[PDB]
Ligand binder design. Structure first.
Ligand code: CHL
Ligand code: CLA
Ligand code: CLA
Ligand code: CLA
Ligand code: CLA
Ligand code: CLA
Ligand code: CLA
Ligand code: CLA
Ligand code: CLA
Ligand SMILES: CC1=C(/C=C/C(C)=C/C=C/C(C)=C\C=C\C=C(C)\C=C\C=C(C)\C=C\C2=C(C)CCCC2(C)C)C(C)(C)CCC1
Lengths: 341, 73, 69, 206, 172, 43
């Protein structure tokens, strides 16, 4: 192939985890101008990719889009003259016809376990039935079918990981986030980012399959009282959380307002510690070798979203003993003291 | 002459039988059920007295589910 | 054995005796004579009386069978 | 929740997670659970047929009374002799086709995986009959648009369905009795009510 | 491999038998001996009906006999057929009672077992179809007294949406 | 009184109440709809 789309869905987190798949694609065929037809807040991840070409905004899960917009995007994908679709939108006919109207050589999608996925095999060269119908709930990997078929042993090795989630920031986002925490009282090497705050905001970057993923504030007040201050910067998803956090944990506690995942990875890259819950920030911390802890609401969910905690040897995983995101708040402080210094 | 009033009969007759049967089953889980056959529990029956309106379907399901006819044990 | 030999006190039991009034009817074991020489130890208490206005009778261990409920 | 008359608790054998529950079962028909499942599928099919019926009656009578098309009265509509086909053939054709439909629906209700697995040939379409749910078959044949791809988390759509369908069934009983003691169409009875409402009701029929 | 996909197949017929689709809703073939006798009688009824139907439509296409004395033709019939039927009754091997082979199987169709099974499936399918066709002949001659089967097919092909079964099945 | 209603619910008192109500029903039907041998509605 030379031109390849991606009709990925979900938001920040699902499109973030697709970066080893894109690196797999460019590792498979030498020069590919990969495109992305994602939802909003999916484009914002694609500063961190150094591989791709357009990265539009479409919201593929709309299911009754604007017919002007729908016809325009069908014709746009026709005018870009692709060779491979790689949907992972998890839909069948109706959307298989959408991938079929693109003049594509290799129509690839995901397919429901249910019925809304019949008649799709007619219009797809790969079927790739998935699980749970809530595809982010499958965990970190989510694409082992698509990873194992893209690059089957036909001439050489698959090479299905290449040190998965190598995100990369540029100098411009580094300078603007440097100004954003330099407005706070942080030093460019010695601070700790969080990105876990109980909120009602779509900049939380969580998942589609996780519900109770974001930790509270008075629980967080206990966590931030139990921990020594290594300048913990606080990453709010919206400005209405600023005064709320300053009411709970204090006025001296620095708050950095970040809603962009590229800005969030730039804030990771200057940090020295990460106390993220199950958001994009765990994977961004595992990118560029930052020591994370990775809070979760379940040990099993933590294994599904981090299967590589034994590999990086810094992301010492902590979850809740029950479900419902209520952990011990003690031993996590202990190994936060252990690994961050 | 016969068939429409025959259905009209059988509908009422099965009403009688079905409310009586559901009443006897209702009092069956009592300490001394016989006193409820003497002293008719009018609230219970009155809550059941209209439950025989739907006897041709409830009885059919109790026959399919196995609740119409008792088992020997 | 000194431990109980028959059903438990309260175990609803069925009668396999063909000559009893409560044949193929359930009961309620109220006692079991643990003496290992009596022939009909199982003292049952039924809900409805017999023709002699009696609700209780002794039964054997082989003339009795507990239900799955 | 609001269960069909305040002052009464809903029965404990039905509550919440069902299409428009509201706890109305005073006569203990959904007491047995499999009976309730059968009755749910019965209700859905009844309500959908009744909705098609109310549409096919109200639309035809809007065309008739106003005078757009010379269609017959719903009451006297069955004895229309069609040129290309006869009613004696149409009853048999309906029997065949709706048997292939309803027996398939049934064999899915008793065995959801059926009609799509093995030797279930319907012109090679053994995939659109996946079912996905009791009473909500889905698939490219049955929901081409797929407004509710999901069906467990589609409580608004199923609630709209069942409420509109209960109301359509009640309106069909209206069509049955209202036009057996008045011998006119529904729209005729409506405009009879909307001229003098306090002088043309059921009890104004002497 | 099922007459109505979805119905639970009974335990006594599951696909192994040559013509098994699990159609025993009345439970006639519960016991094995009656089942074996039934499949024997089924094959025999099938073969007689498949002998019959080409002896109906072929006289009707050319001869138009409508498929409509006693004390000699009856005697010769009984003599010729009772001998064969009792000689058939004198076999005890059941798979040889259904499928004798030997002096009944020339041309070597029974030489390969997989094609033998497939051809047994073919026999039983065509035979059930022919039994249905003969019952159709009989009831179409009962409803329409003086018409032929191919005559009725012409009646259907003339105006199929007006000359069909419905005229007899409902009073109107 | 609870015991008076317990007695009114007894089998003979409730039986005569039920059959008096029923008999009044059938009586008033055979006065309003007398001399009936055939059900003429949808006949
Ligand atoms: C459901 C359904 C309902 C509610 C009715 C209702 C009626 N149909 Mg009927 N039909 C129905 C299904 C069907 N009909 C017919 C074919 C007919 C005929 C041929 C006739 C009716 C007539 C009638 C009336 C009988 C009194 C009544 C209006 C009769 C009528 O219209 O009398 C006023 C009549 O002649 N139906 C076919 C085929 C059906 C399927
Ligand atoms: C299934 C059909 C059905 C039927 C027969 C009834 C019957 C009744 N409803 Mg209910 N109701 C229903 C469905 C139904 N309801 C549904 C689907 C809703 C929406 C959840 C309600 C909500 C509702 C409210 C809020 C109230 C009633 C009330 C009443 C009573 C009106 C008094 C009367 O007899 O006027 C002739 C009556 C017992 C009223 C009543 O008496 O309250 C106890 C009342 O306040 N109903
Ligand atoms: C015949 C059509 C039909 C059928 C099968 C059902 C079936 C059901 N209904 Mg629905 N319903 C209908 C019409 C129907 N409904 C209509 C027209 C209304 C509006 C008046 C409602 C309003 C309604 C409410 C508000 C509720 C139900 C509920 C239920 C369920 C439990 C009760 C039960 O077992 O009754 C089974 C019923 C039958 C077998 C039908 C008996 C018909 C009799 C014999 C005729 C009486 C007609 C006469 C005009 C009165 C069950 C799935 C409950 C639910 O959804 O929660 C689970 C509930 O709370 N029904
Ligand atoms: C359900 C249902 C059923 C059973 C019927 C049945 C019928 N419709 Mg109606 N109809 C329905 C829904 C239904 N309709 C709906 C939802 C719409 C919209 C219509 C609009 C409609 C029109 C516009 C006409 C019919 C006509 C007819 C008749 C002939 C249909 C045919 O195949 O020829 C028949 C009585 C025709 C008729 O009355 O005969 C001339 C006719 O002209 N239907
Ligand atoms: C207006 C009432 C109404 C409503 C709200 C629904 C709602 C629903 N139906 Mg039901 N349905 C109805 C009437 C209705 N239906 C009737 C009359 C029929 C008989 C033809 C059906 C037959 C039917 C089947 C066989 C299936 C559905 C399915 C669905 C779901 C998705 C499609 C949708 O939302 O269409 C809403 C459509 C409109 C609002 C347009 C109405 C236009 C008017 C003329 C949803 C729960 C599917 C489902 O749940 O599977 C997942 C499915 O398989 N329905
Ligand atoms: C929601 C359904 C519905 C609607 C909107 C109507 C509406 C109407 N009906 Mg119909 N009707 C219905 C159900 C319905 N009815 C049912 C279920 C029956 C069977 C008992 C009847 C039997 C009937 C007769 C026999 C007559 C009407 C008449 C009328 C009109 C005058 C009102 C009246 O007499 O009160 C009747 C109201 C009821 C019997 C109550 C039914 C339940 C209500 C509607 C549910 C609440 C919502 C009016 C257009 C009269 C007419 O032709 O007007 C000129 C008339 O003669 N109706
Ligand atoms: C066991 C099967 C069977 C039986 C009982 C009969 C019996 C009869 N046939 Mg038929 N026939 C059969 C098979 C059979 N035939 C077959 C397989 C053929 C095709 C060769 C024919 C071709 C045939 C013709 C062409 C004619 C008969 C005729 C006759 C009659 C002399 C008699 C009623 C004759 C008759 O009078 O009937 C129309 C006649 O003309 N048959
Ligand atoms: C074996 C296949 C077969 C075939 C091809 C036919 C074909 C025909 N039959 Mg016969 N018929 C059959 C079996 C068959 N029938 C059986 C088994 C019965 C017993 C109930 C009848 C009873 C019968 C009567 C009483 C009448 C016909 C009539 C007809 C004609 C019109 C079609 C009709 O009304 O459908 C009738 C269909 C059935 C009764 C169902 C049988 C077919 C089912 C769907 C099985 C399909 C088998 C096979 C795979 C195809 C047509 C020539 C009519 C005719 O000729 O009028 C001029 C007529 O009046 N048939
Ligand atoms: C068992 C044998 C027998 C039979 C079959 C009859 C039959 C009859 N007798 Mg004779 N009779 C008998 C024994 C018998 N009698 C004996 C033993 C005596 C001496 C005690 C008499 C003395 C006698 C007299 C003196 C008279 C009769 C009369 C009658 C007629 C009564 C019609 C009537 O008013 O009902 C109408 C129906 C009812 C009263 C029942 C109404 C039920 C209610 C309304 C519930 C139904 C509605 C419900 C809600 C369901 C609707 C459907 C929907 C909601 C689901 C009928 C022909 C009378 C007559 O007219 O003779 C011809 C008459 O004058 N009989
Ligand atoms: C049509 C008709 C006729 C005839 C008929 C017949 C012949 C019938 C038969 C029938 C039969 C042969 C039947 C059988 C049955 C059996 C059984 C076995 C049953 C059972 C049942 C039950 C068990 C029920 C119960 C109940 C109910 C539901 C009601 C109430 C309650 C109770 C619980 C009692 C004539 C011509 C004369 C006249 C006209 C009409």
């Amino acid at each position: 192939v030379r031109r390849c789309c991606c009709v990925i869905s979900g938001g920040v987190y699902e499109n973030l985890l697709f970066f080893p798949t894109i690196q797999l694609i460019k590792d498979r065929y030498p020069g590919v101008q990969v495109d992305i037809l994602t939802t909003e807040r999916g484009k914002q991840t694609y500063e961190l990719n150094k591989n791709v070409r357009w990265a539009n905004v479409y919201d593929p899960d709309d299911h009754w889009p604007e017919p002007a917009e729908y016809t325009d995007m069908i014709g746009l994908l026709k005018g870009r003259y692709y060779d491979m679709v790689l949907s992972t939108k998890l839909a069948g006919l109706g959307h298989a016809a959408f991938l079929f109207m693109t003049t594509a050589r290799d129509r690839v999608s995901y397919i429901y376990p249910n019925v809304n996925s019949a008649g799709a095999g007619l219009m797809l060269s790969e079927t790739f039935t998935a699980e749970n119908t809530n595809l982010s709930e499958l965990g970190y990997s989510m694409y082992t079918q698509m990873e194992d078929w893209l690059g089957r042993p036909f001439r050489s090795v698959p090479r299905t990981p290449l040190l998965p989630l190598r995100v990369s920031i540029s100098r411009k986002v580094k300078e603007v986030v440097a100004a954003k925490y330099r407005n706070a009282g942080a030093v460019t090497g010695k601070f700790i980012v969080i990105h876990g705050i109980e909120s009602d905001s779509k900049a939380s970057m969580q998942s589609k399959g996780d519900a109770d993923s974001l930790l509270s504030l008075e629980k967080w007040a206990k966590i931030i009282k139990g921990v020594r201050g290594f300048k913990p910067v606080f990453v709010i998803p919206h400005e209405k959380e600023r005064e709320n956090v300053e009411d709970f944990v204090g006025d001296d506690t620095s708050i950095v307002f970040i809603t962009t995942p590229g800005q969030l990875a730039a804030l990771i890259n200057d940090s020295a510690g990460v106390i993220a819950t199950n958001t994009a920030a765990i994977q961004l911390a595992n990118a560029r070798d930052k020591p994370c802890i990775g809070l979760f609401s379940s040990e099993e969910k933590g294994k599904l979203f981090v299967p590589y905690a034994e590999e990086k040897s810094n992301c010492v995983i902590i979850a809740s003993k029950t479900g419902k995101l209520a952990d011990i708040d003690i031993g996590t402080v202990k190994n936060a003291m252990q690994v961050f210094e | 002459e016969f068939i429409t009033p025959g259905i009209l009969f059988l509908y009422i007759a099965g009403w009688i039988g079905w409310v009586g049967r559901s009443y006897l089953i209702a009092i069956s889980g009592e300490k001394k059920p016989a006193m409820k056959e003497i002293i008719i529990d009018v609230p219970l029956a009155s809550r059941i007295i209209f439950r025989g309106f739907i006897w041709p379907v409830a009885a059919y399901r109790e026959f399919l589910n196995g609740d119409l006819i008792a088992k020997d044990v | 054995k000194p431990p109980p030999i028959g059903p438990k006190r309260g175990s609803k039991v069925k009668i396999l005796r063909r000559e009893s009034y409560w044949f193929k009817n359930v009961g309620s074991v109220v006692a079991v004579d643990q003496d290992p020489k009596t022939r009909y130890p199982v003292v049952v208490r039924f809900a409805k009386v017999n023709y002699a206005n009696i609700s209780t009778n002794n039964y054997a261990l082989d003339e009795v069978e507990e239900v799955a409920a | 929740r609001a269960t069909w008359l305040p002052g009464l608790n809903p029965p404990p054998y039905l509550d919440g997670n069902l299409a428009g529950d509201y706890g109305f079962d005073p006569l203990g028909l959904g007491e047995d659970p499999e009976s309730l499942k059968w009755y749910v599928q019965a209700e859905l099919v009844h309500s959908r047929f009744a909705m098609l019926g109310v549409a096919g009656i109200l639309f035809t009578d809007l065309l008739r009374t106003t005078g757009i098309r010379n269609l017959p009265v719903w009451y006297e509509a069955g004895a229309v002799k069609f040129d290309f086909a006869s009613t004696k053939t149409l009853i048999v054709v309906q029997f065949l086709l709706m048997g292939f439909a309803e027996t398939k629906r049934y064999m899915d209700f008793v065995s959801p995986g059926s009609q799509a697995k093995e030797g279930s040939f319907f012109f090679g379409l053994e995939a659109a009959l996946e079912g996905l749910e009791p009473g909500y078959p889905g698939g490219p044949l049955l929901n081409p648009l797929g407004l509710a791809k999901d069906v467990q988390n589609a409580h608004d759509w199923k609630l709209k369905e069942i409420k509109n369908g209960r109301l359509a069934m009640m309106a069909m009983l209206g069509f049955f009795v209202q036009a057996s003691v008045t011998h006119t169409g529904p729209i005729d009875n409506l405009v009879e009510h909307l001229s003098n409402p306090w002088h043309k009701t059921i009890i104004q029929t002497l | 491999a099922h007459w109505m996909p979805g119905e639970p197949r009974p335990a006594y017929l599951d696909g192994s038998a040559p013509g098994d689709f699990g159609f025993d809703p009345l439970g006639l073939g519960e016991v094995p001996a009656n089942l074996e006798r039934y499949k024997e009688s089924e094959l025999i009824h099938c073969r007689w009906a498949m002998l019959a139907v080409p002896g109906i439509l072929v006289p009707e296409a050319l001869g138009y006999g409508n498929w409509v004395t006693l004390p000699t033709i009856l005697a010769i019939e009984f003599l010729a057929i009772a001998f064969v039927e009792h000689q058939r009754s004198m076999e005890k091997d059941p798979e040889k009672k259904k499928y004798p082979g030997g002096a009944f199987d020339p041309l070597g169709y029974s030489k390969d077992p997989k094609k033998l099974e497939e051809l047994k499936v073919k026999e039983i399918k065509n035979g059930r179809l022919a039994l249905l066709a003969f019952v159709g002949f009989c009831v179409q001659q009962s409803a329409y007294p003086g018409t032929g089967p191919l005559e009725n097919l012409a009646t259907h092909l003339a105006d199929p949406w007006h000359n069909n079964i419905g005229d007899i099945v409902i009073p109107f | 009184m609870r015991d008076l209603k317990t007695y009114l619910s007894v089998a003979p008192v409730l039986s005569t109440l039920w059959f008096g109500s029923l008999a009044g029903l059938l009586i008033e039907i055979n006065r309003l709809f007398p001399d009936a041998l055939t059900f003429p509605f949808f006949s």
